[PDB]
Amino acid sequence: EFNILLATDSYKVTHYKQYPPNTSKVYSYFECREKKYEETVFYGLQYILNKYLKGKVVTKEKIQEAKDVYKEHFQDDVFNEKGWNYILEKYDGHLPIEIKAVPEGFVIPRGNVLFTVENTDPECYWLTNWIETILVQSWYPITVATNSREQKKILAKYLLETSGNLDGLEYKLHDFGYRGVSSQETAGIGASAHLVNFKGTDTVAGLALIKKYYGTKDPVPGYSVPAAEHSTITAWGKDHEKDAFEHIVTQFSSVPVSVVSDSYDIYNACEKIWGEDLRHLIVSRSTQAPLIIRPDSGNPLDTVLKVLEILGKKFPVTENSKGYKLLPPYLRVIQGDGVDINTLQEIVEGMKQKMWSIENIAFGSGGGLLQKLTRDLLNCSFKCSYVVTNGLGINVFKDPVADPNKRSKKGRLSLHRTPAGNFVTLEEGKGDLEEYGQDLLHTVFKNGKVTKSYSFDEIRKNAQLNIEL
Amino acid sequence: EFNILLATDSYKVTHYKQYPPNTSKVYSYFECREKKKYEETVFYGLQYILNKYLKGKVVTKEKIQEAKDVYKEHFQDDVFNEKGWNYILEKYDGHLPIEIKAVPEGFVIPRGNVLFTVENTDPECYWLTNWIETILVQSWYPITVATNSREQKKILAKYLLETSGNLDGLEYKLHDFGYRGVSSQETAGIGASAHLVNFKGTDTVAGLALIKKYYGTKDPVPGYSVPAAEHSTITAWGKDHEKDAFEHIVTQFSSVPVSVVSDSYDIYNACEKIWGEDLRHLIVSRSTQAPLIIRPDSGNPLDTVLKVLEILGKKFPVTENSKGYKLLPPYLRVIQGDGVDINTLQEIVEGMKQKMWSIENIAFGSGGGLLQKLTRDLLNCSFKCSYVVTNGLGINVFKDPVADPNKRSKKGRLSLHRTPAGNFVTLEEGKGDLEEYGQDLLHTVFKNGKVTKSYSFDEIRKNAQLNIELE
Numbered sequence: 040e041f042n043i044l045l046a047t048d049s050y051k052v053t054h055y056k057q058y059p060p061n062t063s064k065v066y067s068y069f070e071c072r073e074k075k076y077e078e079t080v081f082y083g084l085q086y087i088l089n090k091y092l093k094g095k096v097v098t099k100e101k102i103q104e105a106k107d108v109y110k111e112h113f114q115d116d117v118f119n120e121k122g123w124n125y126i127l128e129k130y131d132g133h134l135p136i137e138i139k140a141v142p143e144g145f146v147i148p149r150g151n152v153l154f155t156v157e158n159t160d161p162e163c164y165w166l167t168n169w170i171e172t173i174l175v176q177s178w179y180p181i182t183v184a185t186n187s188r189e190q191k192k193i194l195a196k197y198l199l200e201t202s203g204n205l206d207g208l209e210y211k212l213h214d215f216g217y218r219g220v221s222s223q224e225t226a227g228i229g230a231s232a233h234l235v236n237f238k239g240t241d242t243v244a245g246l247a248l249i250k251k252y253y254g255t256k257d258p259v260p261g262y263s264v265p266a267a268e269h270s271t272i273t274a275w276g277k278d279h280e281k282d283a284f285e286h287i288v289t290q291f292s293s294v295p296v297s298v299v300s301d302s303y304d305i306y307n308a309c310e311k312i313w314g315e316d317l318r319h320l321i322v323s324r325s326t327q328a329p330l331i332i333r334p335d336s337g338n339p340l341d342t343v344l345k346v347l348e349i350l351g352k353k354f355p356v357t358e359n360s361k362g363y364k365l366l367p368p369y370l371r372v373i374q375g376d377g378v379d380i381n382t383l384q385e386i387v388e389g390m391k392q393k394m395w396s397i398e399n400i401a402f403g404s405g406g407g408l409l410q411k412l413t414r415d416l417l418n419c420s421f422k423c424s425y426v427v428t429n430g431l432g433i434n435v436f437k438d439p440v441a442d443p444n445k446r447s448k449k450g451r452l453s454l455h456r457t458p459a460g461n462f463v464t465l466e467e468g469k470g471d472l473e474e475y476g477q478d479l480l481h482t483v484f485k486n487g488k489v490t491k492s493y494s495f496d497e498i499r500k501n502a503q504l505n506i507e508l
Numbered sequence: 509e510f511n512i513l514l515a516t517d518s519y520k521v522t523h524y525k526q527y528p529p530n531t532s533k534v535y536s537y538f539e540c541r542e543k544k545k546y547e548e549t550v551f552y553g554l555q556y557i558l559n560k561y562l563k564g565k566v567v568t569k570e571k572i573q574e575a576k577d578v579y580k581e582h583f584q585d586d587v588f589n590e591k592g593w594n595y596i597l598e599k600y601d602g603h604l605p606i607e608i609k610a611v612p613e614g615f616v617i618p619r620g621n622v623l624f625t626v627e628n629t630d631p632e633c634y635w636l637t638n639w640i641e642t643i644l645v646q647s648w649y650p651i652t653v654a655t656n657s658r659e660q661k662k663i664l665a666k667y668l669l670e671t672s673g674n675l676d677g678l679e680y681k682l683h684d685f686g687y688r689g690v691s692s693q694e695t696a697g698i699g700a701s702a703h704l705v706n707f708k709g710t711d712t713v714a715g716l717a718l719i720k721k722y723y724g725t726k727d728p729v730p731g732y733s734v735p736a737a738e739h740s741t742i743t744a745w746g747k748d749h750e751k752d753a754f755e756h757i758v759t760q761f762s763s764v765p766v767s768v769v770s771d772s773y774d775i776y777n778a779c780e781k782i783w784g785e786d787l788r789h790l791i792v793s794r795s796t797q798a799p800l801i802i803r804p805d806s807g808n809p810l811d812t813v814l815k816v817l818e819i820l821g822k823k824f825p826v827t828e829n830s831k832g833y834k835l836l837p838p839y840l841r842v843i844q845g846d847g848v849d850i851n852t853l854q855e856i857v858e859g860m861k862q863k864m865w866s867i868e869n870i871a872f873g874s875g876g877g878l879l880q881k882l883t884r885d886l887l888n889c890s891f892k893c894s895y896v897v898t899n900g901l902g903i904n905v906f907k908d909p910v911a912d913p914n915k916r917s918k919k920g921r922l923s924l925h926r927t928p929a930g931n932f933v934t935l936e937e938g939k940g941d942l943e944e945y946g947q948d949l950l951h952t953v954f955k956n957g958k959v960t961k962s963y964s965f966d967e968i969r970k971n972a973q974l975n976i977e978l979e
């Protein structure tokens with residue numbers, strides 16, 4: 040079972056003897072540090088608060104376990120048993136902590152305070168940065184949600200240009216990354232973050248997380264349709280790729296179905312099998328049940344363009360009102376190999392130059408969507424900005440001589456609307472001057488309790504694109 | 509609770525209706541696929557997955573009904589295979605009728621070889637082999653972390669041996685700083701454990717409990733750390749009192765090793781003026797078993813390391829070792845824990861060597877670079893079907909995309925063998941039955957719900973040793 044006394048960086052175990060004597064208060068903040076990605080979606084803290092921080096997180100057994108572990112780990116007795124016992128005895132194991140945060144789903148420019156942390160008991164000054172490590176893992180849902188949102192922007196732009204509307208946008212980037220993430224837990228968290236912007240997912244773990252920690256009006260937040268894999272085609276034998284195709288589209292004849300077509304020869308499969316041998320089973324399909332062809336190898340733009348040209352000559356293509364070419368409603372394409380934000384952009388622009396509508400295509404992304412991301416992408420960072428020692432409050436910060444981008448903020452922080460309606464972070468307690476209206480941060484955690492929360496439906500609303508609004 | 513019926517890619521829910529009719533067996537393998545450098549991989553992590561997620565009664569009435577409900581909404585259709593899952597529940601008390609054979613954990617195997625194989629042991633459960641692809645393929649992560657950590661150990665070994673003449677302290681030259689930099693708690697524990705196959709130094713505590721629980725060690729714990737400051741414990745003293753903070757911290761830890769981040773305002777001033785003059789007397793008194801380890805944390809990693817050494821070299825009595833390289837006094841060392849990945853690690857040690865500085869002087873800390881900046885396509889970790897039995901006839905199967913020969917998969921029943929020259933080969937098409945190549949190196953690790961062979965973390969470490977260590 041999870042033990043919060045064992046969920047921090049090792050060295051922080053030793054930090055309580057390192058602060059100045061008579062320190063009563065430690066106050067720290069989290070930001071996506073300013074240096075693409077000018078704005079970030081704040082999402083994920085509510086999960087961490089509820090799964091890891093709330094309630095009785097400290098027991099005698101957990102204290103003893105950590106004591107035993109750290110003695111061997113440090114080859115010495117440095118663990119703060121006394122501090123942790125004080126929490127157990129005074130607050131029934133509830134963390135004397137207050138956390139303030141911007142609403143989840145909010146889109147905020149880099150360089151702004153997103154949440155703040157401080158101790159509510161003078162004895163528990165060391166506690167603020169104990170929980171840095173667990174809290175800083177919010178970088179991941181923030182970064183997935185943000186990067187996913189950036190991709191939706193690109194998809195909106197081109198769909199709008201080639202089609203004149205945004206129908207189907209929310210199904211244009213599907214989550215394929217379940218097998219490509221580092222763990223089950225990462226799968227659920229990451230899948231949940233993508234669903235801030237889209238509705239298509241194959242990462243089932245995300246559904247349960249949302250249900251448990253956020254909630255939706257609808258039964259589920261994410262959806263999928265039947266589809267083949269290489270094993271359901273190749274199992275028929277190299278000489279029976281037509282038989283496999285036919286069985287599969289017949290099994291799923293009244294619902295949408297995606298069929299990977301590159302097991303042996305994508306171009307042959309599209310031109311001869313789909314476009315000639317099995318054409319009669321495709322053109323009979325309902326507009327609500329298209330066949331979605333899936334190429335899965337070769338240069339991503341080159342293959343997409345060639346697949347489209349092949350189908351364009353085997354099937355009746357129309358020209359939409361924008362002058363762009365459109366496959367018939369029963370036939371679509373999904374590119375789910377080598378898709379990340381850069382290649383996605385390359386494909387839609389290449390499609391546009393060849394006069395293909397973005398209506399024709401959908402994308403699947405795996406590692407690119409959920410795994411190929413790090414904390415330094417948005418520079419998610421947690422730092423101390425204010426301490427009270429000997430009854431005096433001190434504005435504190437780092438400011439390394441060789442890197443000004445690592446300079447941290449000073450003093451008590453607050454977030455505000457500017458007269459132009461933008462965000463500004465005020466430092467040095469300056470928000471108390473009331474020259475910038477009310478602090479936009481809300482108290483979301485205090486003394487073991489989650490004090491403010493948001494539904495997944497509201498998070499989605501907050502994270503909408505300007506074009507959508 | 510965890511529900512294995514909900515732990516796959518959505519589309520695989522639909523696959524039981526797509527395999528050829530009269531198919532009684534589906535057989536699939538996992539490889540770190542060769543690409544037209546990472547030429548060898550450490551096999552590690554399967555045993556965790558087996559125990560945590562696959563063994564025992566993983567199917568219940570409730571889990572079947574839960575999945576049925578979720579999938580009806582998720583698909584807006586009744587595609588779920590309630591009968592197949594019911595059969596497992598009734599026939600086998602919820603245990604998976606599956607057999608997995610794998611190379612021993614810790615084994616170091618060239619790219620393009622079979623690492624494990626999965627097949628159903630009951631004809632009705634042909635669909636079950638690839639249902640569990642997704643969960644099994646997540647072994648890419650500990651494999652890749654253990655592999656990438658090993659490759660960094662190789663570099664450290666090369667330069668430490670050249671500049672110092674031995675390998676003393678190699679196992680503590682790359683420390684795990686990535687707890688806050690990984691995507692989740694679970695990832696943290698798994699990732700930290702993979703690193704510990706190669707080193708002993710970690711701050712990612714989550715890893716120790718995993719190892720104790722799923723592998724176990726002779727010693728009380730597999731990984732270690734020592735006292736150190738962070739920016740908060742320095743800055744809290746106030747800008748004008750960096751010296752007060754330094755002095756207080758080395759005094760608290762006067763008898764144990766201690767690392768102090770020195771770049772809060774000016775790293776060069778800190779080393780030369782603060783450590784090098786004001787507080788010099790607190791450093792030169794320290795024991796060899798309790799050095800001060802100065803930690804820079806910004807600027808160009810190589811440039812800053814060189815400058816810090818150059819500074820310290822002139823304020824402290826440096827010796828020249830027997831290989832001709834410069835060595836700080838035993839009470840003074842350096843740790844670089846910013847911007848460190850396999851690429852910059854190499855650039856730093858080579859630059860140090862060029863400037864006649866021993867690798868004895870330095871240790872590295874790696875966070876995101878060690879545990880997060882890795883993907884499945886780094887080693888091309890991949891799971892594919894190679895053999896099926898249809899109408900009682902076995903057939904060898906594979907993909908072979910025209911546009912990408914690198915994605916071609918293997919054919920038929922597989923086995924892994926020693927070559928006459930002591931290397932590795934994977935035999936395809938059931939050829940291992942000919943017995944021209946000694947015994948299959950794969951062993952049954954999982955069968956019908958039970959874990960059938962386990963490895964201690966000690967064994968794993970022994971298997972993963974560097975050649976230079978053996979020599």
Ligand SMILES: O=C(NCc1ccc(S(=O)(=O)c2cc(F)cc(F)c2)cc1)c1ccc2cccn2c1
Pocket residue numbers: 210211213214215216217218238239240241262263264265266267295296297331372373375401402403405517518519
């Ligand atoms: O095809 C897959 N999943 C089913 C699927 C089919 C079609 C789409 S789609 O984006 O074309 C689509 C989604 C949707 F929600 C409704 C639709 F009508 C079409 C999305 C997923 C699929 C293929 C490969 C793969 C690798 C890892 C996970 N993976 C999932």
Ligand SMILES: O=C(NCc1ccc(S(=O)(=O)c2cc(F)cc(F)c2)cc1)c1ccc2cccn2c1
Pocket residue numbers: 048050680681683684685686687708709710711732733734735736737765766767801843845871872873875
């Ligand atoms: O300094 C840190 N941790 C303590 C530490 C001190 C010294 C070393 S070392 O590699 O120099 C060393 C390790 C060891 F196990 C024994 C030693 F004597 C020295 C390693 C970690 C430290 C610094 C930054 C950071 C960020 C995230 C996690 N982080 C941990």
